[PDB]
Amino acid sequence: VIDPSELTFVQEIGSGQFGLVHLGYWLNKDKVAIKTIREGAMSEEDFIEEAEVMMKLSHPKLVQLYGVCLEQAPICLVFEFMEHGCLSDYLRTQRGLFAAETLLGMCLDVCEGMAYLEEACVIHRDLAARNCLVGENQVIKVSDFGPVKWASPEVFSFSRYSSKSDVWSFGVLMWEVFSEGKIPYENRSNSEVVEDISTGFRLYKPRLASTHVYQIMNHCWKERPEDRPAFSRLLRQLAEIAESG
C-alpha cells in the first residue's frame, strides 16, 4: 500500500537520525504521523525490509501504519496519529492525576502488544515509555518497533537480545509508568548502574505501585532470562492483579 505524496506536512514532532517525524494529513482527511529517513541513514533495503515486517504485524496495542512513500523524496512511513503523544511525555505532565487503576491499565496495554510481538518472534530492542504512544482515551500502543537503564544483564554484557530482554525492559517501563514518568536510576552512571544491578539492586517501588505490581516488576528483573515470565504470562498475571488488585 504505497503512498505517492498525497501527504501534507504540518509540524515536526519527533526525531533521531533515521529521520524526523512530522504531523501530517493523508488526503486532507486522515491525521497521520510521517516518519522520514534522512539521506544515508538507512539502506533502501533496510527501510524496505523494515516496512514490510512492520506492515506484517498488527495488534490493537501497536501503532497502525497507513502506508509507505517509496515514491521518492525523503522515504517515509505513514503511521496513524496518536492524539496524546508519547506516554513518557504524558506521564510526566498529568503527574498526580493518575489512579493506580489507570496506570496498570497502561501497563496491560503494552503487555498485550508485547505478548503479540513475542509470539510473532519479534524483539523490541528498546521498550521504554518514550516509545509508547497514547491515543484514543488512555489507550497505550507500543511503536518504534520493527539505553542501559532498560537493558537486561545479557544485553549489558553479551548484547544478547531476546523476548526476555524485552520483559526486563518492560519491567523498567512499568516502573516508569507507576512512578508517573520518572527517570530510572537518574542520579547514576551507566558504568555504575551495571554495578548496582549486578549485585542485586533493583529500582525502588513507586508509591502508586502496590506490592503485587512490584512483585511482577521484580520478576521481569530476575537475573536469568529463563527466570522471567514470558509476556504471554505477564499479561495474565497483570490481569489478575488488575481484576482484583
Side-chain angles (χ1 to χ4, degrees):
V1 51
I2 309 239
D3 236 286
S5 86
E6 319 162 318
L7 307 170
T8 278
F9 279 86
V10 202
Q11 301 296 170
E12 239 223 48
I13 59 173
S15 52
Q17 227 226 283
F18 239 52
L20 327 176
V21 173
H22 289 272
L23 146 62
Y25 272 78
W26 177 49
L27 303 178
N28 311 304
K29 142 81 64 186
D30 307 301
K31 204 171 168 183
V32 292
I34 329 211
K35 176 106 194 191
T36 65
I37 307 313
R38 265 274 90 178
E39 205 283 308
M42 253 204 306
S43 177
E44 270 217 312
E45 74 178 295
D46 243 274
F47 150 100
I48 292 177
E49 172 219 2
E50 217 167 314
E52 298 183 315
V53 63
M54 236 178 296
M55 287 175 302
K56 203 75 191 183
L57 306 162
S58 64
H59 191 262
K61 298 303 149 57
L62 304 165
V63 195
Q64 248 167 158
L65 213 20
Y66 266 100
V68 218
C69 279
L70 307 220
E71 319 263 286
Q72 310 303 159
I75 307 182
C76 72
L77 250 20
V78 200
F79 297 88
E80 68 170 310
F81 187 72
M82 292 303 284
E83 196 49 64
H84 285 306
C86 87
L87 187 54
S88 127
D89 199 301
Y90 179 84
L91 282 179
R92 272 174 134 293
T93 139
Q94 235 105 37
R95 184 176 281 175
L97 304 160
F98 296 99
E101 302 189 307
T102 298
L103 299 172
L104 181 60
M106 263 174 241
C107 284
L108 273 172
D109 283 334
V110 181
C111 204
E112 289 172 25
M114 285 304 111
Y116 174 82
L117 280 189
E118 163 176 285
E119 165 181 317
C121 269
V122 164
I123 311 292
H124 195 296
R125 311 203 176 195
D126 186 17
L127 183 58
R130 76 183 93 97
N131 292 313
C132 289
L133 295 160
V134 190
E136 268 175 51
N137 90 301
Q138 298 286 174
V139 177
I140 311 300
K141 296 195 187 183
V142 160
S143 97
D144 255 312
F145 59 91
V148 177
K149 274 173 186 193
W150 283 266
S152 48
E154 355 107 37
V155 181
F156 293 164
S157 352
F158 334 72
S159 188
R160 202 173 293 162
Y161 295 72
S162 101
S163 46
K164 297 301 167 163
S165 302
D166 280 306
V167 161
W168 174 287
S169 209
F170 175 73
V172 188
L173 176 165
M174 278 179 70
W175 188 88
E176 294 195 70
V177 163
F178 274 94
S179 69
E180 294 175 307
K182 266 174 201 148
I183 296 197
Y185 324 91
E186 210 197 307
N187 310 300
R188 254 144 162 180
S189 171
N190 280 302
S191 17
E192 185 168 54
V193 168
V194 155
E195 217 168 312
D196 307 277
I197 285 165
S198 263
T199 101
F201 172 68
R202 293 300 187 274
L203 285 159
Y204 76 73
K205 158 212 288 173
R207 35 187 199 183
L208 299 178
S210 73
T211 124
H212 271 285
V213 169
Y214 197 41
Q215 304 183 179
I216 287 160
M217 257 163 83
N218 275 286
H219 282 349
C220 307
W221 302 327
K222 294 296 177 193
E223 221 101 297
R224 294 156 193 184
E226 61 263 25
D227 289 311
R228 305 169 195 156
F231 276 111
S232 76
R233 162 141 284 71
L234 268 178
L235 175 64
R236 273 72 187 178
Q237 289 176 179
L238 279 195
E240 273 175 53
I241 284 171
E243 256 158 45
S244 12

